[PDB]
Design an enzyme around this catalytic site. Structure first.
Site, short mmCIF file in Angstrom:
data_model
loop_
_atom_site.label_atom_id
_atom_site.label_comp_id
_atom_site.label_asym_id
_atom_site.label_seq_id
_atom_site.Cartn_x
_atom_site.Cartn_y
_atom_site.Cartn_z
N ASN A 1 0.79 -1.24 0.00
CA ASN A 1 0.00 0.00 0.00
C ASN A 1 0.82 1.29 0.00
OD1 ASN A 1 -2.62 -1.03 -0.26
ND2 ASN A 1 -2.63 -1.51 1.95
N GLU B 1 -0.31 -1.50 -12.99
CA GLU B 1 -1.62 -1.62 -12.38
C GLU B 1 -2.29 -2.87 -12.90
OE1 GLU B 1 -1.39 0.40 -10.18
OE2 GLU B 1 -0.49 2.28 -11.07
N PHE C 1 -13.14 3.21 -19.79
CA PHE C 1 -13.09 2.44 -18.54
C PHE C 1 -13.93 3.02 -17.40
CE2 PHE C 1 -12.02 -0.78 -15.42
CZ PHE C 1 -11.87 -1.93 -16.18
N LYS D 1 3.58 4.20 -1.21
CA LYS D 1 3.82 4.82 -2.50
C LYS D 1 5.17 4.44 -3.10
CE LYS D 1 4.56 9.32 -4.63
NZ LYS D 1 5.49 10.43 -4.84
N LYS E 1 5.26 2.19 -6.22
CA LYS E 1 5.18 1.00 -7.10
C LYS E 1 5.38 1.30 -8.55
CE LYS E 1 1.21 0.15 -5.22
NZ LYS E 1 1.36 1.12 -4.11
N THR E 2 4.57 2.23 -9.04
CA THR E 2 4.64 2.61 -10.43
C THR E 2 5.95 3.31 -10.66
OG1 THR E 2 2.16 2.82 -10.67
CG2 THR E 2 3.62 4.12 -12.26
N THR E 3 6.35 4.10 -9.66
CA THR E 3 7.60 4.84 -9.82
C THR E 3 8.77 3.87 -9.86
OG1 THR E 3 7.45 5.52 -7.49
CG2 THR E 3 6.98 7.17 -9.23
N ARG F 1 16.27 2.97 -16.39
CA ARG F 1 17.59 2.38 -16.24
C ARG F 1 17.88 1.54 -17.51
NH1 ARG F 1 18.66 -0.81 -10.89
NH2 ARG F 1 19.06 1.33 -10.22
N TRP G 1 -15.44 0.75 -14.37
CA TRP G 1 -15.35 0.08 -13.07
C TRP G 1 -16.73 -0.16 -12.54
CZ3 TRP G 1 -10.48 -1.36 -11.39
CH2 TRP G 1 -9.43 -0.63 -11.95
N1 LIG Z 1 -1.10 5.39 0.55
C1 LIG Z 1 -1.47 6.27 -0.37
N2 LIG Z 1 -2.44 7.20 -0.11
C2 LIG Z 1 -2.80 8.09 -1.09
N3 LIG Z 1 -2.34 8.21 -2.30
C3 LIG Z 1 -1.38 7.29 -2.56
C4 LIG Z 1 -0.91 6.33 -1.68
N4 LIG Z 1 0.06 5.57 -2.29
C5 LIG Z 1 0.17 6.09 -3.53
N5 LIG Z 1 -0.68 7.12 -3.75
C6 LIG Z 1 -0.95 7.87 -5.01
O1 LIG Z 1 -2.16 7.41 -5.60
C7 LIG Z 1 -2.02 7.35 -7.02
C8 LIG Z 1 -2.17 5.90 -7.39
O2 LIG Z 1 -0.97 5.27 -6.94
P1 LIG Z 1 -0.87 3.72 -6.65
O3 LIG Z 1 -1.87 3.18 -5.69
O4 LIG Z 1 -0.81 2.99 -7.95
O5 LIG Z 1 0.50 3.90 -5.93
P2 LIG Z 1 2.03 3.89 -6.49
O6 LIG Z 1 2.10 3.26 -7.84
O7 LIG Z 1 2.90 3.25 -5.46
O8 LIG Z 1 2.36 5.39 -6.68
P3 LIG Z 1 3.38 6.08 -7.54
O9 LIG Z 1 2.92 6.21 -8.96
O10 LIG Z 1 3.61 7.45 -6.99
O11 LIG Z 1 4.64 5.29 -7.45
C9 LIG Z 1 -0.65 7.91 -7.24
O12 LIG Z 1 -0.66 9.24 -7.74
C10 LIG Z 1 0.04 7.71 -6.13
O13 LIG Z 1 1.14 8.66 -6.01
MG LIG Z 2 0.69 2.80 -9.39
#
Ligand SMILES: Nc1ncnc2c1ncn2[C@@H]1O[C@H](COP(=O)(O)OP(=O)(O)OP(=O)(O)O)[C@@H](O)[C@H]1O
Ligand SMILES: [Mg+2]
Ligand SMILES: Nc1ncnc2c1ncn2[C@@H]1O[C@H](COP(=O)(O)OP(=O)(O)OP(=O)(O)O)[C@@H](O)[C@H]1O
Ligand SMILES: [Mg+2]
EC number: 2.5.1.17
Lengths: 157, 157
Positions: free
Chosen positions: A11, A102, A65, A13, A15-17, A25, A67
């Site tokens: 949960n 995702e 999309f 932040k 993952k995508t980054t 890289r 949902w």
């Molecule tokens: N715990 C959290 N609470 C709120 N927003 C979040 C949280 N974790 C990530 N986000 C943000 O919610 C959006 C969806 O992100 P997601 O759930 O896919 O997280 P993520 O892929 O880890 O985020 P990011 O893209 O910044 O790496 C992103 O813009 C992300 O930055």
């Molecule tokens: Mg993400």
């Protein structure tokens, strides 16, 4: 090198980054990468802006999309359409890395068959590394993966 | 299924036989198999007689093969020629299994580059299972393998 399967879940932040930092890289190193984003953002795609011009193919879910429970037929069709591109990338011997951003949600909401996922991953070119991202990744995908990093939110702004 | 790398080594009898018993099983199951035999026997090829007519491709080392120290150039060339076929099989997405019979000797006598071996194995189609046989298999191939069975000669007639 042997391609591996990397999973960024949890949960927290990043993952995508993490996935795109990996793709960057790889690109910086002259490798070929392809990307599929299972979720369309309302915002301008920085990653894509950066990478795309380097020849990186990007495949994004259609804007339609929903949902919405009522629209599962139409939604699943769109999901399947985008996945078609993914399957193709997962079968391209010339692609060093494939990012499936995702993708967890697609499986979690049953818009994409798990079996289809395991199959395409299992059958990919040997040197191909795949990065999968998303909260709540299916246990069967986690088992197949070589590296699984769980982003634990110790704190979030 | 994900293809794996199986190694039958050891001084006990049954390496080549295990490999072809595996290929037979695969053929009996409708799978596509290709075979490369790095060592030419003076005798009629029973395995080949059996399998070949099922569409199994067989690639055997040329009769010229000497093992003579003086002839390494010519021998290595022949080895390389046969390996060319192997590399091709190891790159064919439609081949479910590839048998590399007596390949250990090729590496042990330096007639085939190890690196070339590790590469082609690492880069093969994902569902591809490879069976390698031979006494004294190189440690680096053994490490790459998923299953390694060592035939220990408890007794031999
Ligand atoms: N715990 C959290 N609470 C709120 N927003 C979040 C949280 N974790 C990530 N986000 C943000 O919610 C959006 C969806 O992100 P997601 O759930 O896919 O997280 P993520 O892929 O880890 O985020 P990011 O893209 O910044 O790496 C992103 O813009 C992300 O930055
Ligand atoms: Mg993400
Ligand atoms: N310990 C041994 N002593 C003598 N001959 C052997 C021994 N092990 C195997 N053989 C025979 O020597 C030939 C070369 O076999 P190799 O060393 O490749 O063994 P193998 O592949 O395990 O044998 P096989 O083809 O019967 O399974 C074969 O005909 C084989 O049957
Ligand atoms: Mg043998």
């Amino acid at each position: 090198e042997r391609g591996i399967i990397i999973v960024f879940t949890g949960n927290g932040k990043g993952k995508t980054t993490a996935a795109f930092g990996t793709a960057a890289r790889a690109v910086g190193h002259g490798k070929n990468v392809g990307v599929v984003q299972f979720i369309k953002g309302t915002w301008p795609n920085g990653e894509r802006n950066l990478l795309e011009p380097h020849g990186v193919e990007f495949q994004v879910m259609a804007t339609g999309f929903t949902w919405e429970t009522q629209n599962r037929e139409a939604d699943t069709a769109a999901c399947m359409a985008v996945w078609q591109h993914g399957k193709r990338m997962l079968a391209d011997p010339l692609l060093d890395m494939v990012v499936l951003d995702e993708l967890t949600y697609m499986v979690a909401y049953d818009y994409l068959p798990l079996e289809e996922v395991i199959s395409a991953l299992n059958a990919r070119p040997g040197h191909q590394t795949v990065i999968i991202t998303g909260r709540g990744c299916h246990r069967d995908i986690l088992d197949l993966a070589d590296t699984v990093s769980e982003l634990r939110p110790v704190k979030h702004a």
